[PDB]
């Protein structure tokens, strides 16, 4: 991913305000609610029967933390997303067989969650920079398919 | 296909747009043109600059069309037939672009209506926009 | 959204299918499992070997469901409500898989009914299968 | 793209029966009829207003022949599709901005045309081999997006 220094600064500044403990769970939870077929990959996570059960599920919150951490790892090395996500790509593609459209969906759900949290601060240019990031992360996750 | 709960959620959430229709629709367009610059190809003679009055005016048209869709949510192909002819037959808009605008509309609603944009309403709005997109990308005359 | 002419094309084409509906359903499943091996994960306990009586039996069910859908092309959500709950709520099938089976059905029809599989009929059938797929991947109770 | 010896033999045997003057035009024509937004990329080709007009259009036929030629070349370079298709990828992605889902659609329309022409010869194992090929070609065309 090629961000201008201005775009990188904007993205980094906002991410510094993102709640490490909660935002990943909110994004993963909304993925499970908005695109219900994705629940099939999380049988062992317990109760996903209603939107409240999903968003309150401890394993969703916990797993969401890991997901956010991976996005954070991407942010830390934008010039080497493919390298950073190589192990995760093997897992999601070769082992789990997640259709790669779903990678795009989760990235876009994260963008919605950022907009929800930050309101007016999530300007169109800030969004545009994040869209480059989440597209890069999705492409890196899908690398074993390419 | 929308559930009864979906229709309830959409009517309630979109109902809060009101007089901000033009503003929110324009913001959604601006987000799309900036985040996904390939979409600009469909508007070759528009002023697409930040704060453009032309984008503002077009935002109002899009938002009002969505209001129309909500008011006819059980019978959308007949209500949107003119818009389907425009986007599918005349303009031949690639279906991917409707996913892009739909996402930017959700982002706009999330940024302006924090209390309304619950996970359940988010889900319903996404389905609604997908349904509208299917109508606008179909040729069914 | 299907046009009036689309509906006529689908009814005419599926009518020609007639008594081979079951055979073609089994072949489409076989094509899908072989061409897109990830789809087999939805049938972990199935005998999926060539000539499988279980796949043949399931192919007949799929074909009969399509025949029902063609009969109720104007009212597919109501007609397919049980099937939608099965695929969208219980089985949670990723929508990509419906594109894969739909393609394998078209391939099966093309191979068996080449005279019937004109460009216009191809177009109408693709739209019809997309419409069925949307109903089966929607939760609308 | 790796094919078993059995798959390679079967792919080659079927392709030898393809009418190289017609099949590409049939595939391209059906793309334009079945997925009508794709016509936007071919505004200069003249009459595309009816299925008969599309399928009988000389420019669709002529262009279709070029497309088929690219698939034919691909069959001889299955281990280096990203290299072979690099110039075409730059054209379709960077210049024309064709959304890559359309590459997948054209590949699957080609498969439908092969099924139409060869019926019982286009067995499910033969189809499976061809799906590997058209997926490889679509992926190589989309490479600039990855
Ligand atoms: C698109 C961005 C995504 C990122 C950054 C991401 C990140 C991660 C991470 C960090 C893990 C834990 C890896 C480990 O413990 O070794 C994981 C596991 C997993 N992911 Fe994702 N993921 C993404 C998309 C998805 C999607 C879209 C799905 C399904 C629809 C999915 C399904 C799973 C599953 C099933 C697991 C294993 C959970 C378990 O331990 O049972 N992932 N992912
Ligand atoms: C929910 C989705 C959409 C809605 C409700 C919508 C609605 C509308 C409306 C109401 C108009 C004006 C019609 C008139 O003047 O009579 C319009 C025009 C137009 N739309 Fe959309 N639209 C949608 C998606 C899109 C997308 C995704 C694109 C392309 C990226 C697009 C491209 C255009 C163009 C090019 C025009 C004509 C502009 C001009 O030359 O005047 N539309 N649309
Ligand atoms: C046009 C599309 C489809 C139609 C018409 C269809 C129809 C059917 C029918 C009639 C049944 C039997 C239900 C019953 O008698 O209880 C069934 C079951 C099932 N379908 Fe589909 N289906 C479609 C697409 C798919 C796809 C794309 C998948 C996954 C790749 C899928 C996975 C399944 C599974 C796993 C079962 C249950 C099998 C079992 O364990 O008994 N279906 N479907
Ligand atoms: C997926 C397999 C595809 C293959 C193998 C393929 C191959 C080709 C080839 C060989 C050319 C000629 C390049 C040249 O003259 O230098 C071409 C041009 C072109 N392609 Fe494709 N293509 C594919 C998909 C698509 C799709 C899906 C579209 C969507 C519309 C598209 C749009 C075009 C256009 C507009 C041109 C230029 C036509 C002109 O000269 O006016 N291609 N392609």
Distance CA B38, CA A146 (A): 23
Distance CA D40, CA B91 (A): 8
Distance CA D11, CA D131 (A): 11
Pocket residue to mutate for ligand 1, from A35, A74, A91, most atoms within 8 A of Cβ: A91
Query: How many degrees, rounded to 5, is the angle at CA D34 between CA D33 and CA D35?
Result: 95
Distance CA C71, CA C68 (A): 5
C111·D34 Cβ contact <8 A: no
Secondary structure of A47-73 as H, E, C letters = CCCCHHHHHHCHHHHHHHHHHHHHHHH
Chain C, 118 to 137: residues with Cβ < 8 Å from chain D are 118-120, 122-123, 126
Question: How long a stretch of residues is chain C?
Answer: 141
The residue whose CA has the least distance to atom 32 of ligand 4 is: D41
Q: Does A89 touch chain D (CB under 8 A)?
A: no
CATH number at residue D34: 1.10.490.10
Distance CA D109, CA D134 (A): 10
Q: Which atom of ligand 3 is nearest to the CA of C91?
A: 35
Which residue numbers come right before each break in chain D (C to N over 2.5 Å)? Answer: none
- D109, D30 Cβ separation under 8 angstroms: yes
Q: A85 C-alpha to center of ligand 3: Å?
A: 34
Question: What is the end-to-end Cα distance of chain B in Å, rounded?
Answer: 21
- Sequence-separated contacts (24+) of C126-132 with Cβ below 8 Å: C126/C102, C126/D34, C127/B138, C127/C2, C127/C6, C128/C2, C128/C6, C128/C10, C128/C69, C128/C70, C128/C73, C129/C98, C129/C102, C129/C105, C130/C102, C131/C1, C131/C2, C131/C76, C132/C66, C132/C69, C132/C76, C132/C80, C132/C98, C132/C102
- C1, B135 Cβ separation under 8 angstroms: yes
Tokens for C8, please give them: 């006529």
Distance CA C45, CA C47 (A): 7
The residue of chain B nearest to residue A34, with distances taken between CA atoms, is: B123
Tell me the three state secondary structure of residue D100.
Answer: coil
Distance CA C126, CA C98 (A): 12
Distance CA B124, CA B6 (A): 5
Q: How far is CA D115 from the centre of its chain?
A: 14
> C120: burial class by Cβ within 10 Å (0-12, 13-18, 19+)?
middle
Distance CA D62, CA D45 (A): 10
| Shortest CA gap C120–chain D (Å) | 6
Resolution of this entry, Å: 1.6
Distance CA B101, CA B28 (A): 7
Among the bound ligands, name the one nearest to the CA of residue D102.
Answer: 4
D115·C111 Cβ contact <8 A: yes
Instruction: List all residues 6 or more positions away from C66 whose beta carbon is below 8 Å from its beta carbon.
Output: C14, C21, C25, C132
Question: How long a stretch of residues is chain D?
Answer: 146
**Residue A65 sits in which domain range?**
1-146
Q: How many CB atoms lie within 10 A of CB A109?
A: 27
Nearest Cα neighbor of D37 from B92, B139, B83 is: B92
Q: Which residues of C7-27 are buried (b: 16+ CB within 10 A; e: fewer)?
A: bebbeebbeebeeebbbbbbb
Around B30, how many Cα atoms within 13 Å sit in the side-chain half-sphere?
A: 23
Q: Any binding-site annotation on A132? A: no
Name the phi and psi angles at C73, rounded to 5.
-65, -20
Name the phi and psi angles at B46, rounded to 5.
-80, 150
Around B122, how many Cα atoms within 13 Å sit in the side-chain half-sphere?
A: 31
Q: Give the best residue of C38, C40, C87, C94 to mutate against chain A (max A CB count within 10 A).
A: C94
Among the bound ligands, name the one nearest to the CA of residue B38.
Answer: 2
Q: C130 C-alpha to center of ligand 2: Å?
A: 24
Tokens for A87, please give them: 């192990």
Q: How far is CA A118 from the centre of its chain?
A: 17
Query: How many degrees, rounded to 5, is the angle at CA C99 between CA C93 and CA C105?
Result: 110
Instruction: List all residues 6 or more positions away from A146 whose beta carbon is below 8 Å from its beta carbon.
Output: A139, D139, D143, D146
Nearest Cα neighbor of B123 from C83, A37, A60 is: A37
Distance CA A107, CA A70 (A): 12
Tell me, what DSSP letter sits at residue D46? -
Distance CA A135, CA A10 (A): 17
Each domain of chain B, given as residue ranges in start order, spans 1-141
Distance CA D70, CA D115 (A): 20
Asked whether B93 lines ligand 2 (CB < 6 A), one says yes
Q: How many CB atoms lie within 10 A of CB A20?
A: 11
Instruction: List all residues 6 or more positions away from B36 whose beta carbon is below 8 Å from its beta carbon.
Output: A131, B97, B100
- Chain B and chain C share a number of CB contacts under 8 A equal to 27
Distance CA C25, CA C104 (A): 9
Q: Which residues of chain D are within 8 Å of residue C114 when distances are taken between CB atoms?
A: 116-117, 119
Instruction: List all residues 6 or more positions away from A138 whose beta carbon is below 8 Å from its beta carbon.
Output: A100, A103, A104, A106, A107
Q: Which atom of ligand 2 is nearest to the CA of B97?
A: 27
DSSP codes joined into one string, A87-104: HHHIIIIIIS---THHHH
Nearest Cα neighbor of A82 from A138, A5, A7, A15 is: A138
Q: B33 C-alpha to center of ligand 2: Å?
A: 13
Q: Which atom of ligand 4 is nearest to the CA of D71?
A: 5
Q: Which residues of B37-64 are buried (b: 16+ CB within 10 A; e: fewer)?
A: eebeeeeeeeebeeebeebbebbbebbe
Ligand 4-lining residues (CB < 6 angstroms): D 38, 41-42, 44, 66-67, 70-71, 88, 91-92, 96, 98, 102-103, 106-107, 137-138, 141
Asked whether A107 lines ligand 1 (CB < 6 A), one says yes
> Based on the structure, what is the number of domains in chain D?
1
Q: Which residues of chain B are within 8 Å of residue C140 when distances are taken between CB atoms?
A: 1-3, 6
C94·A97 Cβ contact <8 A: no
Q: A85 C-alpha to center of ligand 1: Å?
A: 11
Fold for the domain defined by B1-141: Globin-like (1.10.490)
The residue whose CA has the least distance to atom 32 of ligand 1 is: A41
- D109, D116 Cβ separation under 8 angstroms: no
Pocket residue to mutate for ligand 2, from B28, B31, B35, B42, most atoms within 8 A of Cβ: B42
Asked whether A15 lines ligand 1 (CB < 6 A), one says no
Q: Which residues of chain D are within 8 Å of residue B38 when distances are taken between CB atoms?
A: 97
3-state helix, strand, coil in chain A (%, to 5): 80, 0, 20
| Location of structure tokens 């959304």 | D99
Among the bound ligands, name the one nearest to the CA of residue A102.
Answer: 1
| Location of structure tokens 């690398």 | A143
> D134: burial class by Cβ within 10 Å (0-12, 13-18, 19+)?
buried
Distances (CA, A) of D54 to D50, D67, D135: 6, 16, 26
Minimum-distance CB partner of D108 among C103, C112, C117: C103
Tell me, what DSSP letter sits at residue D18? S
Query: How many degrees, rounded to 5, is the angle at CA B116 between CA A133 and CA B99?
Result: 40
């Amino acid at each position: 991913v090629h961000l201008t220094p201005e775009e990188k600064s904007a993205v980094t500044a906002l991410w510094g305000k993102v709640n490490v403990d909660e935002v990943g769970g909110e994004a993963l939870g909304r993925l499970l609610v908005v695109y219900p077929w994705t629940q099939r990959f999380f049988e062992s996570f317990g109760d996903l029967s209603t939107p409240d059960a999903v968003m309150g599920n401890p394993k969703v919150k916990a797993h969401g933390k890991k997901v956010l951490g991976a996005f954070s790892d991407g942010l830390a090395h934008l010039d080497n997303l493919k390298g950073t996500f190589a192990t995760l790509s093997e897992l999601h593609c070769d082992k789990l067989h997640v259709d790669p459209e779903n990678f795009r969906l989760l990235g876009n759900v994260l963008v919605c969650v950022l907009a929800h949290h930050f309101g007016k601060e999530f300007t169109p240019p800030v969004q545009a920079a994040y869209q480059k990031v989440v597209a890069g992360v999705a492409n890196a996750l899908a690398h074993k398919y390419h | 296909v929308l559930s009864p709960a979906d229709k309830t959620n959409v009517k309630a959430a979109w109902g809060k747009v009101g007089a901000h229709a033009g503003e929110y629709g324009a913001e959604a367009l601006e987000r799309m043109f900036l985040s996904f610059p390939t979409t600009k190809t469909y508007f070759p003679h528009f002023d697409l600059s930040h704060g453009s009055a032309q984008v503002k005016g077009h935002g109002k048209k899009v938002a009002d069309a969505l209001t129309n869709a909500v008011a006819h949510v059980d019978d959308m192909p007949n209500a949107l037939s003119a818009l389907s002819d425009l986007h599918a037959h005349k303009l031949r808009v690639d279906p991917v672009n409707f996913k892009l605008l739909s996402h930017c509309l959700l982002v706009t609603l999330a940024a302006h209506l924090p209390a309304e944009f619950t996970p359940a309403v988010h889900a319903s709005l996404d389905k609604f926009l997908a349904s509208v997109s299917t109508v606008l990308t179909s040729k069914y005359r």
